[PDB]
Write an enzyme that holds these catalytic residues in place. Sequence first.
Site, PDB file in Angstrom:
ATOM      1  CE  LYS A  52     -21.956 -32.166  20.513  1.00 33.06           C
ATOM      2  NZ  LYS A  52     -20.278 -32.088  20.116  1.00 33.06           N
ATOM      3  CG  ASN A  83     -18.575 -33.379  15.201  1.00 36.58           C
ATOM      4  OD1 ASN A  83     -17.471 -33.393  14.699  1.00 36.58           O
ATOM      5  ND2 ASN A  83     -18.838 -33.579  16.276  1.00 36.58           N
ATOM      6  CG  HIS A  94     -14.293 -32.532  24.712  1.00 37.41           C
ATOM      7  ND1 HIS A  94     -14.004 -33.652  24.207  1.00 37.41           N
ATOM      8  CD2 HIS A  94     -15.380 -32.196  24.440  1.00 37.41           C
ATOM      9  CE1 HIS A  94     -15.131 -34.213  23.414  1.00 37.41           C
ATOM     10  NE2 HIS A  94     -16.037 -33.517  23.784  1.00 37.41           N
TER      11      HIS A  94
HETATM   12  O1  LIG Z   1     -16.475 -41.986  19.804  1.00 35.39           O
HETATM   13  C1  LIG Z   1     -16.214 -41.881  21.158  1.00 35.39           C
HETATM   14  O2  LIG Z   1     -16.440 -42.697  21.924  1.00 35.39           O
HETATM   15  C2  LIG Z   1     -15.492 -40.766  21.772  1.00 35.39           C
HETATM   16  C3  LIG Z   1     -15.792 -39.511  20.705  1.00 35.39           C
HETATM   17  C4  LIG Z   1     -14.814 -38.428  21.117  1.00 35.39           C
HETATM   18  N1  LIG Z   1     -14.459 -37.457  20.287  1.00 35.39           N
HETATM   19  C5  LIG Z   1     -13.624 -36.492  20.575  1.00 35.39           C
HETATM   20  O3  LIG Z   1     -13.171 -36.097  21.502  1.00 35.39           O
HETATM   21  C6  LIG Z   1     -13.443 -35.677  19.107  1.00 35.39           C
HETATM   22  C7  LIG Z   1     -12.750 -34.492  19.195  1.00 35.39           C
HETATM   23  C8  LIG Z   1     -12.303 -33.770  18.042  1.00 35.39           C
HETATM   24  C9  LIG Z   1     -12.413 -34.710  16.881  1.00 35.39           C
HETATM   25  C10 LIG Z   1     -13.088 -35.863  16.784  1.00 35.39           C
HETATM   26  C11 LIG Z   1     -12.991 -36.336  15.440  1.00 35.39           C
HETATM   27  N2  LIG Z   1     -11.956 -36.221  14.349  1.00 35.39           N
HETATM   28  C12 LIG Z   1     -10.734 -36.710  15.031  1.00 35.39           C
HETATM   29  C13 LIG Z   1      -9.887 -36.215  13.733  1.00 35.39           C
HETATM   30  C14 LIG Z   1      -8.389 -36.619  14.023  1.00 35.39           C
HETATM   31  C15 LIG Z   1      -8.100 -37.242  15.453  1.00 35.39           C
HETATM   32  C16 LIG Z   1      -6.880 -37.590  15.450  1.00 35.39           C
HETATM   33  C17 LIG Z   1      -5.210 -37.164  15.011  1.00 35.39           C
HETATM   34  S1  LIG Z   1      -5.037 -35.955  13.831  1.00 35.39           S
HETATM   35  C18 LIG Z   1      -3.477 -36.130  13.864  1.00 35.39           C
HETATM   36  O4  LIG Z   1      -2.652 -35.424  13.288  1.00 35.39           O
HETATM   37  N3  LIG Z   1      -3.090 -36.986  15.059  1.00 35.39           N
HETATM   38  C19 LIG Z   1      -4.152 -37.427  15.597  1.00 35.39           C
HETATM   39  O5  LIG Z   1      -3.926 -37.930  16.455  1.00 35.39           O
HETATM   40  C20 LIG Z   1      -8.993 -37.646  16.038  1.00 35.39           C
HETATM   41  C21 LIG Z   1     -10.284 -37.493  15.861  1.00 35.39           C
HETATM   42  C22 LIG Z   1     -13.342 -36.545  17.900  1.00 35.39           C
HETATM   43  C23 LIG Z   1     -15.472 -37.847  22.509  1.00 35.39           C
HETATM   44  O6  LIG Z   1     -16.272 -36.798  22.566  1.00 35.39           O
HETATM   45  O7  LIG Z   1     -15.124 -37.990  23.562  1.00 35.39           O
END
Ligand SMILES: O=C(O)CC[C@@H](NC(=O)c1cccc(CNc2ccc(/C=C3\SC(=O)NC3=O)cc2)c1)C(=O)O
Length: 439
Positions: A115, A138, A183
């Site tokens: 993506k 994103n 996920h």
């Molecule tokens: O970088 C990596 O290695 C892993 C990235 C990996 N990302 C996520 O799963 C993912 C899913 C949704 C959003 C995000 C980015 N934005 C975020 C915003 C807030 C949080 C956490 C919060 S907000 C709150 O209120 N309490 C939280 O813990 C975590 C990520 C990341 C993945 O795809 O496995």
Amino acid sequence: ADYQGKNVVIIGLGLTGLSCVDFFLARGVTPRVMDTRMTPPGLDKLPEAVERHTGSLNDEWLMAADLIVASPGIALAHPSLSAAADAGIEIVGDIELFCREAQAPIVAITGSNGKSTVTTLVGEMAKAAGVNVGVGGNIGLPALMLLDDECELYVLELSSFQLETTSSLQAVAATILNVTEDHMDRYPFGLQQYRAAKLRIYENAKVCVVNADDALTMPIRGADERCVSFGVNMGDYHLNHQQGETWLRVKGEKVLNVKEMKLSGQHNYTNALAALALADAAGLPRASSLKALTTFTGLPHRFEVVLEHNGVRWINDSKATNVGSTEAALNGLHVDGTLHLLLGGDGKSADFSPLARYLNGDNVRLYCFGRDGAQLAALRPEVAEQTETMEQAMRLLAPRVQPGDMVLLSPACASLDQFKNFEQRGNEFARLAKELGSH
Ligand SMILES: O=C(O)CC[C@@H](NC(=O)c1cccc(CNc2ccc(/C=C3\SC(=O)NC3=O)cc2)c1)C(=O)O
Ligand SMILES: O=S([O-])[O-]
Ligand SMILES: [Cl-]
Ligand SMILES: [Cl-]
Ligand SMILES: [Cl-]
Ligand SMILES: [Cl-]
């Protein structure tokens, strides 16, 4: 939309939460912020004028709200949020806020893999046409930071999580590139619930672009009104193999010999097709889009050669945060000597089994680390070693590396158990490769 007078709560800080704060302040609305983390990223950047509550959700604030803006990083099914939903309180995310205001067409891209490449590629195709384009979502700038009257086209990478809170997207062209298990920790009704979040991207899209080789990318219905498709042997946009050469074709017509591309590999060719289908649908001139395909070099951390020295290639594929992405790295991989494959991190409850078919023969070693290191080693215990950290794994493998070998970080897992993000994990891999891969 008009937010004046509303009681707005933003859940989740960081750059995207900050973008939401700023969006409301600029419209004369002072929101309140909460974050379940005690010291969330960006806290020191939040003005003292904005009330905040950290370390937990505050149900007094949520139940009092007129509008809740939920980060994609917080589960929509969190009991505090289901309570607010049951009470009729509107819940949106940043993408929804953006869609309500945007004054240019939006190309919208999701999928389990591809993506960011496809988003960046369509952004480059737009630039090549002289179009004022905002690329992000994103990746790059949170979408609200792209909002600009002068923008002529937006190209947004959207995650399943952002799509769950978006209702007003009407994309000029939308795609799900593929759907493979990811996920699962956030989708307790499994693969079909994760797919259902992504299928939201097609609602009210002018053109839908689907993967002819992945049935899960297709809407659950469409009638006299079909999607445009890309694929390998079939699709409106598809590949033509000629001896050892590959062409991009559109309905039987050759449009590019892939030797003109800097990207190599079948899955990049189908990424190129998907990007061309989206660009065409967005009205960009074919010739400038093809020019962009020839100049694009790829993203950091995407199967990136960070060192080729003394007969050894060290490859940073830290962007491989799920099983499907590591499959794409391994499938058809050519290694002259031994492949030293680094796997590890937070596997998000994935079935790692699909990887096993690539791990036979005498020329593979596994070095497995992080939260799910043991499960990964179990794919083939006789050629595996387990360590706590990636650095330990690197220092363990490096003395064994011979000319002809490849060292591949393609970890099939999120990095978040041990790293800020997969970029940090890739940068650390690169530093260690440069240390260990020369005299
Ligand atoms: O970088 C990596 O290695 C892993 C990235 C990996 N990302 C996520 O799963 C993912 C899913 C949704 C959003 C995000 C980015 N934005 C975020 C915003 C807030 C949080 C956490 C919060 S907000 C709150 O209120 N309490 C939280 O813990 C975590 C990520 C990341 C993945 O795809 O496995
Ligand atoms: O604000 S975000 O990019 O976590
Ligand atoms: Cl915390
Ligand atoms: Cl042509
Ligand atoms: Cl050399
Ligand atoms: Cl082999």
